[PDB]
Amino acid sequence: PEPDMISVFIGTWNMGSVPPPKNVTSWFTSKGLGKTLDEVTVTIPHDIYVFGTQENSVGDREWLDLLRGGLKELTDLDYRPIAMQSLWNIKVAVLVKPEHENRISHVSTSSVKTGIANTLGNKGAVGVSFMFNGTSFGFVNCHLTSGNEKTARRNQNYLDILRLLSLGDDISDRFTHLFWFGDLNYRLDMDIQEILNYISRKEFEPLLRVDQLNLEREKHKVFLRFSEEEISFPPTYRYERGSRDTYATNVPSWCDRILWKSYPETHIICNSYGCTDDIVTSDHSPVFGTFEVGVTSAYIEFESIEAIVKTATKFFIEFYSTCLEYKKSFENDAQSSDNINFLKVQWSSRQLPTLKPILADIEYLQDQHLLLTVKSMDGYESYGECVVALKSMITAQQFLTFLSHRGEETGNIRGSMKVRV
C-alpha cells in the first residue's frame, strides 16, 4: 500500500532580481546540461518538488502561485504546498503530489541572517523540514558571501547557519536526509582566460580541480559529511542576460550547488544534477537535482560502549529514536588517557540501558536509527552525537562511528549491541 521510495526534485536559482520567464519547463524536468533526464519514462512527476531561489523579487504569494500553476500545467496534478519560507529575497517552497498530503507531518520552517555589517537578509538561509511517513527531511536554501577572495567568510556563513537554524544540538543529525542548496558562491582559483579556454573545449575536470567548494570539502573545512553528485555541466555564473552564448574578478564559477547528508545505511540515489541552457532572465542558470529516496512506514541491548572524547571527567549517554516512546545511561565506570585533551571512557553493561522499540517486526526495525549523545555529568553539555543504523545490527554486533558537535568532529565511539526479535 504505502510507498517504500519517493522521487524528490530540488531546484536552485539565483534570479538576479528580475522577473522570471513564464516558461521554466527545462528546470522542472531536468533538461539541459549535465546529468539530465532524457527519456519520457524517467521524466516523471516527482513526489516532492522543492524550489530554492535567491535574489527573488517576486512576491511570496505570486511566486508560490507560479510554481503551483507551473506544476499543474506540466503534470495535470494539483500539487499541494506544504510549506514555504522567505527571508527577504531568499525563498523556498515545498510542494507534494495530492495523494501524499496525508503522509506529511511535523512541518517546520526557519531562517537565519548571516552578516557582519549587513542584516537585511539578502545573505543567509531559509529552511523547511517535515516527515514523510516515518522518514524525516530537511531542506536548506542559502545565499552565502560573494567574491573570489571570501572563501573564509563563506565557510563561516555555513557554520553560523548550521548552528543557528532552528528546524524541527545542531541540525546536522536531526533529519534522515538533509539537503543543502543555493547560491553557495564558491569560485574557481584560476585566471579568466584559462577558464574560458577549458570551457570552450568542454573540459571541466581541470576547472573542478580548482573549485573552492571541492578544495574546502577535500580539506575538511566545510560541509562535513555531505555528498555532491559529479558535475558535468558548465559553470552557471556569470552569463549575459538574453542568451547563454557569452559569459559576462567574478570569473565563471559553479556558484549554484546541491549537496546532501543522509543517515547511514539509507537508500538515496541522485538521478539528475545539471543546469538549464534556455532560461536567460538572470546572470545565473537554474540548477536541478533529482533523487530517489527510501521511505519507511523487541529489545535493544548493549554489552559495552567505549568513546574517546575531547576534554580537559564523568560522562553519560542519551539514546533517542523515533521508534522509541528517550533513555539514558549511568556514568562511565572506567576511563584512561594516553594523550592530553583526550579521554577514553568506557561503559560496562551495568551502566547501559535496555531500549524497547514500538513494533517488533524485522521489516520495521531494520529501517530505524538510534541517536546517541555523550553528555558531561557536570553541566549536561553535549560533547558529541552520532547516528547508528539498526539495519546491520539485527548475537551481539559491533558498531563503530564518530562523534560530532556543532560542526566539529569531537571523537569516536565503538560499542557492542543486540537487537532481539
Author numbering: 419 to 586, 593 to 672, 683 to 731, 746 to 760, 763 to 775, 777 to 845, 848 to 874
Which text from the study accompanies this structure?
The two main enzymes responsible for PI(3,4,5)P3 degradation are the tumor suppressor phosphatase and tensin homolog (PTEN), which removes the 3-phosphate (3 P) and the SH2-containing inositol 5-phosphatase (SHIP), which dephosphorylates the 5 P to generate PI(3,4)P2. The SHIP Ptase domain belongs to a family of Mg2+-dependent inositol phosphatases with specificity for 5 P dephosphorylation of inositol rings. Here, we report the crystal structure of SHIP2 containing the 5-Ptase and a C2 domain (Ptase-C2), revealing that the two domains tightly associate via an extensive interface. Importantly, even in the absence of a localization effect, the C2 domain provides activating signals to the Ptase active site, resulting in a significant increase in catalytic turnover.
In order to disrupt the hydrophobic core of the domain interface we mutated F593 and L597 to aspartates (FLDD mutant). Crystal structures of Ptase-C2 FLDD confirm that few hydrophobic interactions remain intact between the Ptase and C2 domains. The FLDD mutations also disrupt interdomain hydrogen bonds between R649 and E862. When comparing the catalytic turnover of the FLDD mutants we find that the C2 domain no longer has a significant effect with either substrate, indicating that the FLDD mutations largely mimic the absence of the C2 domain. We note that the FLDD mutations increase intrinsic Ptase activity with PI(3,4,5)P3-diC8, but importantly the presence of the C2 does not cause any further change. The PS-mediated increase in activity on vesicles is maintained for the FLDD mutant, whereas as with soluble substrates, the increase in activity due to the C2 domain is abrogated by the interface mutations. Removing the C2 domain abolishes observed SHIP2 activity, whereas the FLDD mutations partially reduce activity of the wild-type protein.
